[PDB]
Each structure stands twice: as structure tokens, then as C-alpha cells.
A paper describes a structure:
To provide a comparative context, we also examined wild-type MtaLon in two states: without any nucleotide (MtaLon-Apo) and incubated with 5 mM ADP (MtaLon:ADP). Unexpectedly, both MtaLon-Y224S:ATPγS and wild-type MtaLon, whether with ADP or lacking nucleotide, predominantly formed left-handed spiral pentamers or spiral hexamers, rather than closed-ring hexamers. Surprisingly, the pentameric form consistently emerged as the most prevalent class. The pentameric assembly forms a left-handed open-spiral structure. The open-spiral pentamer forms a large gap between the protomers Ob1 and Ob5. The pentamer forms a tensegrity helix triangle (THT), consisting of three overlapping LHs from Ob1, Ob3, and Ob5, forming an interlocked, letter A-shaped structure that tethers together five protomers.
The Lon protease is a AAA+ protein found in prokaryotes, archaea, and eukaryotic organelles. Lon is involved in cellular protein homeostasis by degrading damaged or misfolded abnormal proteins, which prevents these unwanted protein species from forming toxic aggregates. Lon is known to form a homohexamer; each protomer is composed of multiple domains, including an N-terminal substrate-binding globular domain (NGD), a long-helix domain (LH), a three-helix bundle (3H), a AAA+ ATPase module, and a protease domain. We show here, using cryo-electron microscopy (cryo-EM), that the activation process of the Lon AAA+ protease may involve a pentameric assembly and a substrate-dependent incorporation of the sixth protomer to form the substrate-pore-loop contacts seen in the translocating state.
Numbering used by the authors:
A (entry chain D): 497 to 774
B (entry chain E): 249 to 496
C (entry chain C): 547 to 645
D (entry chain E): 596 to 645
E (entry chain E): 695 to 744
F (entry chain D), G (entry chain C): 249 to 298
The structure:
């Protein structure tokens, strides 16, 4: 949808800005290159500035020497005009990380990936709430702990870790920006990777809610979580079973990258995000 | 001052408002505040020459030569300027209209901002000015102070126009980060207005009444703080990062 | 009833299928969203964990399934939900009975 | 003692860190109007060290 | 004892990882006035060495 | 303006108040606000679209 | 304004100040709120039921 906004209305606006009508032309992976590389916004502001700078470098490079009136810019040489990739071109590249649970959330100026990191020490058995937490992430973490204490034969853990592992937990934006503690299976993944000492998979974002029997209960606003995964470059999303119902009202453009592995018991989100599971 | 209006060439609006402030004269000119402020607006307007320009360069190559003689280009800040001027040789619709910002400058305190602006005025072959912005108490060194009575302070921009003769100078805007005013409302509004390309042609102040056409004139701006500026001064303000200097 | 009413004006003024119309049951999720609350909570395969109190709420009552997680360990009593002591009183009382 | 590099928009300047590892109990002491993000990176510092 | 004439800027994680930094060249403006000849940086801002 | 109060189509009490602005003036046009306050107020309620 | 006072049946603890703002007359509205607040407060006195 961003690319089609470009070729229909945006990019002709820019090559009418810089006077270069009938001079520069632009491909498929050109616009898709500017999109997946040089902005991570939530609208189309950044794309209009970046197409502005392509227009100005087109003005100069045609200006001091003017040979061609049919300038094709393809997805191999745009760093001449713009430079280094400011972002990953691909977030299919980010190499299973230890304490990293890719969160999904909605910072209310645009979708995020609230990567909770959690560090597991040796020690005395105590939870620490860094990143300026409220109580909310502490108690969802406590719920994930009680679920996990119900199931310590699986995850390789000795049966009484809770008395001897102090927990240090880092949360960027340490309160709920959406006003929702919907990072349940986020913190379940983070804590099970942190205490399991095993890397949590990149490239599969997840969002949910857990409760003490081991239940992935449903969330609110499923569309915006799916769009934050669609902007910020993630592909597979993990959602509760109780949102088959919200899911099929979605306009079928939105659904065309995503690959959902629906869960309701937290053992099933935790069989997907960890490669070395215990 | 009655002869002065057809002694000095004008645009139509400057001519007409000059005739207006001529008409409010010819009484006591030592008190009676309509007469004295008409005399000041008649002097500050009619002693601005018009109907003539500086040489507007249409050559970045001339420009790349001239700018590289006061400090020596510094490998990044020069070519951003050359980009902005590169679209200046490719004005849309064959009229020189901006539709673009005016290259506001921030850097460390001490790098050659004056050298940049005056060097531009050489390279653009224009007449440099710089008027009062950095730390002003009220829109009387920035904008106008309202007339029909004296106590009204003229524009220092109008002073730069009464000092220049031509219709395209390089008006330096220094340290706009500390631009304050005792007037309710920012002069940053008159900044973001005048920098859109067709808003200077109709622009007035509280000191200006009929549109004093500032139309054909490129503007430039400096300051020295990376964080604080009005939010309307992040449209039509192209922040260019200036670095300090090292040992070579 | 407002959402039924306005979408009724929509599906009308695209082009009128009639001069007088009727809506009965299960001609609702056309006119409304997905049905938000499932029917009677009896349908729900009784849970291994938790029963469901009635409760006051100062804007009028509701239900509250009070989940309890018997986690094998030391011998204590936590209370999540950031309770007062009053639940620890009642939990210890009920625990005393069971003892 | 460790020297601190910064930009400051007043013109460039520097810092130095001074740490008094006093006999105590784990209870972190910060002085010099040390900001909350320095407090959190101190938590991360001592935590990385643990 | 630490070292001399070696300075540094960098962000640590609660895992202890150098998360990269913004305004690199500016830090070298403020810092390479102070003549410190060997400065240590995050790995990811080779992107502004170039 | 006394031409325009007719010309500026307005409601009745607004036309009335505009003539009252006309009557409180016709003695101040050099003035510190006593001119300019009723002059800009006459200019506003001429240039608001009715 | 006078009849509106004398067709509502008011207490004389009202009609005293009613005749007081009938006494306060013969001043400006266009130059100041002097008969504005007078006549409008007095019309509040009229149009509340007694």
C-alpha cells in the first residue's frame, strides 16, 4: 500500500517539485528499497522527504552535467543519492538472541517492537523492575513464573530455581503505552529464555495475555498489533485462539504477508519462539 | 519628501503606501503623532530603492569557486548548499519559486557562519545583510511595531532594504533560537509565513500596511542550539549540521 | 441500537430493497459486528481451577473468577491482584477449615 | 576514575567519573545531580558485573 | 588501574551489549579537541566512519 | 467602512453594533488603542463571512 | 425595561434595587460596560419567576 501510494500520487509529486518532469524514472524495488531501508515510520511523511532528496540529487547530477533525459534509478545504486542504510533492509536477519522477546505494542505515535530484555543472575530469589516498571509487568512476570513452576520438567530447570535466581528485567517504556498489559507471552518468552539461558527466535513477533492456569487469554485491538508487525518489518505473528473472530473482518490487503500460529495454551507459543527449548 | 516618491522607483504597492503616508503629512511635524509616524514610514519606505537587482548567479561553478576561498569547503557542508542551489537552477515552471526551506544553520559556537553568509552573498553575487534577531524583546527589531502614532519602531529589515538598492539580498537570520517578543504571538509565525514562496510578496508587519513585496528574495538563517526551536520552525527550515574544527 | 440504525440507513440508501423491512434473530451480525459476548456462561466446560464470585463494583455488580495457583514449593501465601490483608485473612480462614 | 566524552551544544566539553567503592551493603550512592538514566545504566552496570 | 589517553562513548544493555550511538562525528569534534588519541566506539557506527 | 457596513452583509444586531463601533469612533484615528481597537474590530466584523 | 419590572410580581426587596438600576441610567454602552451590565443584570431580575 505504501508503494502504490508512491507510484500513484507521491513520486510524481516529487518529480514535479524538482522540475525534473520527463527526466527521471523509478522502478519497483526502487520505491520498495526506500521503504524497507530509509524509514521506519507509521505514515508516509518520511517517504515524501526521501523522495525529495532523490529529486534534489537528481537536480545536481543532471545539473552540472546534463546528458540523459531518461534517468532510471533501480535498487542497486540509490546510495549515490542517499547513502548508508539507516536500518536493516531485512528483519529476517537478526540471529536468535538470548534475553530478547520481541514485543508488539502500540506506542501511540506509531507501532513499535518493545524488545523486553531480561537478565538472570545467580542469587537469592527476587524480582527487580528496571525500565521504570509499574506493578503490572511484575505481576504478569509472576504469573509466568507460577506457570513455569507448574512445568519445570520441560524447560531443563531445576525444580527450585525461584529461591536462588534473582531476576533483573529491563522494559523500555516501563508502563503500558496503549494502556494494556498485553505483553504476556512476550514476558513469558523473555523469562523462559532468560532462565532457560537459550536464545529466543527473531523474526517472529508475539503479543497476548497469560493467566495462572497457563492460559493465553484474548487481547484488544488486533488490527493495530498486526500493522505494527507490518510496518516494523516482522513477518510471523502469534495471537490467541480467541481471536479468530476479530480476524476475519480484516481487509485482505492487511493479511497478505503474515503467517499466524494461533495459540491458547502457553506451551504452544513457547514451542515456537525458542529453538533450544530447555 | 513629497518629491521623494516619484524621485525613487518603486513597486506599485510601495508607491501607493508612500503616497498614503505622504497624504497624512503637511501639518505640525514636531508633535501630532499621525504626522511624525507618517514621516518615518515615508522615509523608511521611499529611501529604499527598487526596480533593480543584484546579479543573481545561475552558476554553481562560480559558486563552488567563490565559497571555497574563505574557509575551504569542509567536505560536507559545502555540498548540501550545492544541492539546495542545484534545485535553484531547476526552478519549476520557469519561475524562480522556492516551495522549499531556507537552510537554517546550527553548529558549534565559533565556526564561520558569518563567512558562510557573506561568502554566499559573493557567490550568489548579492548584497549581504544581517538584522537583529538574537535575543530581541519585542517584534520591533524582528517585525513591525504598529503605526498611526509614533512610538512605532521601524523594521530593521526595512533598514536593510533602505541600505540596499536591489530586490534580492541575502538576509542573514542570526540565532533565531533565542528570538523572543513582548508581543503576544511568535515572530516565528512571520518566519514560517514569509519563507513559503508567495507569502513574502503579500507580506506586511505591524509597521507595514500595504503589501511590502519581499517577493524575489532568498533568505538564510543561523542559530547555535540543536534542540530548542519553535515547532512551526521545523517546516520551511532546513537544518544543516555544521561541525567544529580540528587541528589541521 | 444506534449501530443497527445507521447501517440500516446505509443498506437502504445504496438502493432500497423494499418499502418496509424486517430484522429477526441472526439478521444481526450483518448489521452489527461480531457478537461480542457469547451466550450464557454455562456453555463453558467446567474449569479445573476456579469458581466465580458475584461482586459489588461501585458502578454496579459483575463476576470475578478468582484464580488460585497451587504451586509446589515451600509453604507460604502470596496474594497477587495487589490485595489488602483482608483476602489473606479470608484465605487463611478457608485454609484453616480445609486443614 | 574514568574520563567522560560528551557533546554539549554550548561548544564541546568533557566529563570525569569518580567512584568511591565504600564499605557498605549493595546500596547504590549517586552524587552530582546524576540523572535517572545514569541510575538505570548503573543498574545495568552493576547487573552486568553480577 | 585503568589506561591513559584512551576515551570512550557507548551504550550498554542489561545483557551487556554495545547499542550504537548517534552523533558520532560531533562526539569526535568535542573529543578530538581534547587530543585523546585512541577512542573506542560501538561496532555499528562504522556507518559514520565512512 | 461606513460604506461597507451596508456592503458587508450581516445580521441585524451585528449591523447595529457595527454602527455603534462607527459612533464610538469618528474622533480618534491617531490613537493609542482608542483608534486602533475599534478600527481592527470594525475590520474583523467586516471580514468575517456572513 | 420599567414595565418588565412591574408586570412580574416581585418582592419589594427586589423592587428596591430594580428602581436602583432604573436610577443608574443615562450612560455609555459603546464606550464602556456601564449600562450594559446595568440593563442585563436588571433583565435577569425581570425574567426569574416571583
Amino acid at each position: 500500500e505504501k508503494q502504490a501510494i508512491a507510484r500513484q500520487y507521491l513520486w510524481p509529486k516529487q518529480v514535479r517539485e524538482s522540475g525534473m518532469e520527463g527526466r527521471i524514472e523509478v522502478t519497483d524495488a526502487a520505491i520498495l528499497r526506500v521503504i524497507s531501508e530509509y524509514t521506519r515510520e507509521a505514515g508516509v511523511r518520511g517517504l515524501e522527504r526521501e523522495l525529495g532528496k532523490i529529486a534534489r540529487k537528481g537536480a545536481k547530477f543532471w545539473l552540472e552535467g546534463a546528458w540523459e533525459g531518461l534517468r532510471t534509478i533501480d535498487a542497486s545504486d540509490i546510495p549515490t543519492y542517499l547513502g548508508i542504510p539507516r536500518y536493516r533492509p531485512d528483519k529476517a536477519e537478526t540471529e536468535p538472541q538470548v534475553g530478547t522477546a520481541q514485543g508488539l505494542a502500540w506506542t501511540p505515535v506509531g507501532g513499535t517492537l518493545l524488545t523486553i530484555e531480561v537478565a538472570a543472575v545467580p542469587g537469592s530469589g527476587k524480582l527487580s523492575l528496571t525500565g521504570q516498571l509499574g506493578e503490572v509487568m511484575k505481576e504478569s512476570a509472576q504469573a509466568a513464573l507460577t506457570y513455569l513452576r507448574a512445568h519445570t520438567q520441560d524447560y531443563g530447570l531445576p525444580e527450585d530455581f525461584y529461591n536462588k535466581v534473582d531476576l533483573h528485567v529491563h522494559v523500555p517504556d516501563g508502563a503500558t503505552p496503549k494502556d494494556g498489559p498485553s505483553a504476556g507471552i512476550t514476558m513469558a518468552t523473555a523469562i523462559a529464555s532468560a532462565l532457560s539461558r537459550r536464545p529466543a527466535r527473531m523474526d517472529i513477533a508475539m503479543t497476548g495475555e497469560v493467566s495462572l492456569r497457563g492460559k493465553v487469554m484474548p487481547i484488544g485491538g488486533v488490527k493495530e498489533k498486526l500493522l505494527a508487525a507490518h510496518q516494523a518489518g516482522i513477518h510471523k505473528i502469534v495471537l490467541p485462539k480467541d481471536n479468530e473472530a476479530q480476524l476475519e473482518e480484516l481487509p485482505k490487503e492487511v493479511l497478505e504477508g503474515l503467517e499466524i500460529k494461533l495459540v491458547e495454551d502457553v506451551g504452544e507459543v513457547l514451542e515456537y519462539l525458542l529453538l533450544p527449548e530447555p | 519628501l513629497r518629491k521623494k516618491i516619484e524621485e525613487v522607483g518603486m513597486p506599485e504597492a510601495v508607491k501607493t503606501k508612500a503616497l498614503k503616508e505622504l497624504d497624512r503629512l503637511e501639518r505640525m511635524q514636531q508633535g501630532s503623532p499621525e504626522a511624525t509616524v507618517a514621516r518615518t514610514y515615508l522615509d523608511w519606505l521611499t529611501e529604499v530603492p527598487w526596480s533593480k537587482a543584484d546579479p543573481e548567479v545561475l552558476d554553481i561553478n562560480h559558486t563552488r569557486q567563490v565559497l571555497d576561498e574563505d574557509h575551504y569547503g569542509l567536505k560536507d557542508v559545502k555540498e548540501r548548499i550545492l544541492e539546495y542551489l542545484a534545485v535553484r537552477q531547476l526552478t519549476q515552471g520557469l519561475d524562480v519559486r522556492n516551495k522549499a526551506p531556507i537552510l537554517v544553520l546550527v553548529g558549534p559556537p565559533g565556526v564561520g557562519k558569518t563567512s558562510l553568509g557573506r561568502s554566499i552573498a559573493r557567490s550568489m553575487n548579492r548584497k549581504f545583510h544581517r538584522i537583529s534577531l538574537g535575543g530581541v524583546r519585542d517584534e520591533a527589531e524582528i517585525r513591525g511595531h504598529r503605526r498611526t502614532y509614533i512610538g512605532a519602531m521601524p523594521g530593521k529589515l526595512i533598514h536593510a532594504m533602505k541600505q540596499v538598492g536591489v530586490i534580492n539580498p541575502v538576509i542573514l537570520l542570526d540565532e533565531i533560537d533565542k528570538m523572543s517578543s513582548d508581543w503576544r504571538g511568535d515572530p516565528a509565525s512571520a518566519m514560517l509565513e514569509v519563507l513559503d514562496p508567495e507569502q513574502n510578496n503579500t507580506f506586511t508587519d505591524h509597521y507595514l500596511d500595504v503589501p511590502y513585496d519581499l517577493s524575489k528574495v532568498f533568505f538564510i538563517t543561523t542559530a547555535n542550539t540543536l534542540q530548542t526551536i519553535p515547532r512551526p520552525l521545523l517546516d520551511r527550515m532546513e537544518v544543516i549540521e555544521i561541525p567544529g574544527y580540528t587541528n589541521m
